[PDB]
Amino acid sequence: KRYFPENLEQNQSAARLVSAVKARASEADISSIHLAIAREVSPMFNVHE
């Protein structure tokens, strides 16, 4: 992973932002990413939420 610049992850001022980023970022499922790509051209029948 490389969500942060060097040093910043361990920086004390930054802790709030890193808890935010780590909360948003997830483990990379290749499945959900290929899926996210294919959904971009796939016809939509059921409505996405």
Binding site for its own copies (CB under 8 A): 6-7, 15-16, 19
CA distance 19 to 31: 26
In the complex, least distance from residue 30 CB atom to its own copies, rounded to whole angstroms: 31
Phi-psi bin for 7: left (phi > 0), alpha (psi -120 to 50), beta? left
Residue with Cβ nearer its own copies (6 or 49): 6
Cα separation, 21 vs 15, whole angstroms: 10
Residue 10 CB, shortest distance to its own copies, in Å, is: 9
Work out how close the CB of 18 gets to its own copies at its nearest, in angstroms, rounded to a whole number.
10
